[PDB]
Design a protein around this nucleic acid. Structure first.
Ligand SMILES: [Mg+2]
Length: 712
DNA sequence: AGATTAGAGCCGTCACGTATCAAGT
DNA sequence: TGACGGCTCTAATCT
DNA sequence: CTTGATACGAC
């Protein structure tokens, strides 16, 4: 059974050893203005580490670790307290604080020992994470690593920009070239100073996972995290009862459902007219409208589906795609047109769709045509235009037709609740929208306003709000309710879907192992390689050309130079015909990875019984053991296609908790939601994270906001 | 009064191929 | 107003 | 003997 690994950390600190070799102490800046002393005081000190605890009931602010305690002075506005490790519980401290305090001493360099650290946050950076930013203004983006109270390891990106003087008030950070991390600066020191906050229009991003090679892997979030964890394990082995490793977990109700081809939605729009018109006459949308109309005509996909694409002058019945100028707050006339009666309108803007940079007077937009026939109808953007058009038709007609009888009959007995926390109207207020399906698959939208102060009402809309209200940690801000996605109701059974910051983390240990096996340079010796292949020859069994390819590989290394890089051998195999795409090479390729000192290609992309890239694909359900007895259920959404060599983002964990119906809730509804979450018309070419009726609800609420500005 | 968490706003993301099971004269 | 989620931010919050 | 329309793969 597969095993996903979340962010949660599993570890045990060697408590006595931590007490034996270090003397911790806590500092509570009593008065606001006091910080300033604490700083000068901290500058004259040399603590092993510093961390912030932010105890609920005060109980100190900064916990700091030394080897030998300096003579503690007494100053007003703050107070210091030498602590014993058993009182660690007393002051509202938790083992995550000790783990963070120990982690602050590590660095990203391989085989890095412990070092003193005055900065209460691990901020890992590199020389390759720096842009010039026009004229002499340095800028570095770093990966802050922090262990929170829930034992989650949050990784964030923080941008630092150069300043030309030692500035008080705001914190001052300096880059340590050798260690690679950013250190807080307490006194004016030689070097260059940085402050938090980007001052450019380039949002720095770090790829979540890189699989191209080891060098690119170590430049990703997973690579840096794995390096830090390995350094911590090899440096704190005396201080750790159990090594710091990511949580294991089992996966249940896995759904390897295959998304249908995106051209299926094109078939749905069959036999109807699709008008295209522009906002008055701006010479920009007018021209873009003509180009869009002509391309669809020659696509030959609409001709198969008998789609009438007509370039009209103004509003027409049926499907109508229009072109506007994205005026909004541009201090001009807004050409956006509101659909009325049976008209269905989907709007597109020249700036976004045509990538119209302020410049050339003619639109250079061109659909991405590929796959033998160069038909623009396969363009991702144009496909999504039809995808929304079908949804808006369903909303107008009030009938479900997109998901085929099958899925529709599966979603018939379930009802969905969507919560929209109102911005204005002082008193806290959320909009509860309930969607119901008739046996004839007709949409029934109903909403009831509820006040967050008085939930004593017995009506259904109030009761569901009361159930969610207790579940949420701080139901006072927007983001508390924005985290809530929907509430699936099966009559007397309810289930809540909530977002979380917990994410899937692939096995960093295995990724490092295979990538090191496939290191591009990986200097070898001819004798050892020949012997290595020789001993494993009896274990290759035989699959016809499989052994012949293996024997061909053995002969290839025989005639080569005694010391060669792996790239030269890899290049030689390409001439030999052992392309890493045919059945013969792949079996040789996979066999080498399991037991050898080199491999032509890793097995990371390909699926395996126990693949290290687990949880990044398909839909699965897991039961993370958070609190003793209180099992928590989560579901993750990956990607149906094979993952690209580089993965930019990660997979978050949505949370399912039974609002009513004990534990039988999750086992029954999840297979229903599994088929709900396998539709490609919400997220193009990808699994929808939430059930698709949530999409339907969002558009209906958006339509309400158009004529109800007070709800915005 | 610095820490933070909020709350909003943005970049990224959605292809050719060898394998093949059955579509046959 | 391709639009969808992560998530990086900045400002707002709560000190 | 022959090819046509789905899959794990790269990359
Ligand atoms: Mg829209």
């Amino acid at each position: 059974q597969s095993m996903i690994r979340t962010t949660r950390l599993d570890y045990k600190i060697n408590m006595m050893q931590l007490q034996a070799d270090f003397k911790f102490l806590v500092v509570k800046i009593i008065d606001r203005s006091a910080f300033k002393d604490y700083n000068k005081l901290l500058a004259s000190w040399s603590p092993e580490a510093v961390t912030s605890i932010r105890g609920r009931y005060k109980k100190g602010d900064y916990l700091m670790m030394f080897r030998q305690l300096p003579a503690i002075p007494t100053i007003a506005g703050l107070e210091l307290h030498e602590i014993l490790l058993e009182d660690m519980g007393e002051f509202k401290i938790y083992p995550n604080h000790l783990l963070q305090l120990l982690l602050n001493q590590q660095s990203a360099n391989e085989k890095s020992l412990l070092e003193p650290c005055k900065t209460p946050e691990l901020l890992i950076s590199g020389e390759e994470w720096y842009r010039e930013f026009r004229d002499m203004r340095q800028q570095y983006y770093a990966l802050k690593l922090k262990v929170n109270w829930q034992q989650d390891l949050e990784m964030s990106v923080q941008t630092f920009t150069q300043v030309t003087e030692f500035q008080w008030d705001k914190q001052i950070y300096q880059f340590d070239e050798k260690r690679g991390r950013f250190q807080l600066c307490y006194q004016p020191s030689p070097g260059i100073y940085f402050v938090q906050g980007n001052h450019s229009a380039n949002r720095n991003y770090i790829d979540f996972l890189s699989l191209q090679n080891k060098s690119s892997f170590y430049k990703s979030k997973v690579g840096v995290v794995q390096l830090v964890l390995d350094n911590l394990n090899l440096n704190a082995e005396k201080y750790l009862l159990r090594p710091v490793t990511f949580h294991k977990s089992l996966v249940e109700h896995s759904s390897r459902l295959k998304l249908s081809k995106r051209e299926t939605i094109w078939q749905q729009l069959a036999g109807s007219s699709l008008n295209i018109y522009a906002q008055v006459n701006d010479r920009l949308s007018q021209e873009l409208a003509d180009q869009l109309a002509d391309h669809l005509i020659r696509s030959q996909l609409v001709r198969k589906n008998s789609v009438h694409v007509v370039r009209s002058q103004k509003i027409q019945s049926g499907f109508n795609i229009q072109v506007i100028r994205d005026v909004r707050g541009r201090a001009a006339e807004d050409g956006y047109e509101v659909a009325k009666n049976d008209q269905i309108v989907q709007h597109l803007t020249v700036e976004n769709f045509g990538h119209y940079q302020e410049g050339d007077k003619e639109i250079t937009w061109k659909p991405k045509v590929s796959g033998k026939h160069h038909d623009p109808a396969r363009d991702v953007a144009i496909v999504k235009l039809i995808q929304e058009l079908c949804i808006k038709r369903d909303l107008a007609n009030g009938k479900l037709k997109t998901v085929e009888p099958k899925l529709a009959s599966l979603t018939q007995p379930l009802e969905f609740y969507y919560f929209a926390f109102l911005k204005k109207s002082f008193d806290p207020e959320v909009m509860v929208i309930k969607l119901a399906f008739t046996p004839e698959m007709e949409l029934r939208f109903s909403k009831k306003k509820v006040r967050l102060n008085a939930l004593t009402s017995d009506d259904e809309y109030t009761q569901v709000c009361k159930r969610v209200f207790d579940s949420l940690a701080a139901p006072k801000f927007y983001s508390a309710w924005d985290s809530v996605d929907c509430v699936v109701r099966s009559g007397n059974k309810q289930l809540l879907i909530q977002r979380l910051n917990r994410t899937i983390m692939p096995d960093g240990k295995q990724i490092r192992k295979q990538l090191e096996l496939n290191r591009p340079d990986k200097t070898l010796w001819r004798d050892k390689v020949v012997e290595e292949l020789g001993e494993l020859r009896p274990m290759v069994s035989g699959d016809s050309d499989y052994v012949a390819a293996y024997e061909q590989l053995q002969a290839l290394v025989t005639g080569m130079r005694p010391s060669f890089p792996l790239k030269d051998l890899d290049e030689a195999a390409r001439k030999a015909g052992l392309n890493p795409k045919r059945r013969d090479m792949r079996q040789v390729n996979q066999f080498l990875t399991e037991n050898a000192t080199f491999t032509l290609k890793t097995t990371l992309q390909r699926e395996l019984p126990d693949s290290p890239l687990a949880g990044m694909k398909w839909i699965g359900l897991t039961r993370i053991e958070e609190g003793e007895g209180h099992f928590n259920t989560f579901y993750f959404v990956g990607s149906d296609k094979s993952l690209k060599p580089v993965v930019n983002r990660a997979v978050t964990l949505r949370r399912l908790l039974p609002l009513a119906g004990d534990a039988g809730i999750i086992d029954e509804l999840f297979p229903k939601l599994a088929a709900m979450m396998s539709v490609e018309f919400v997220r193009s070419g990808q699994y929808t994270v939430v059930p698709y009726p949530v999409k339907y609800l969002r558009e209906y609420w958006y339509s309400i906001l158009r004529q109800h500005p007070e709800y915005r």
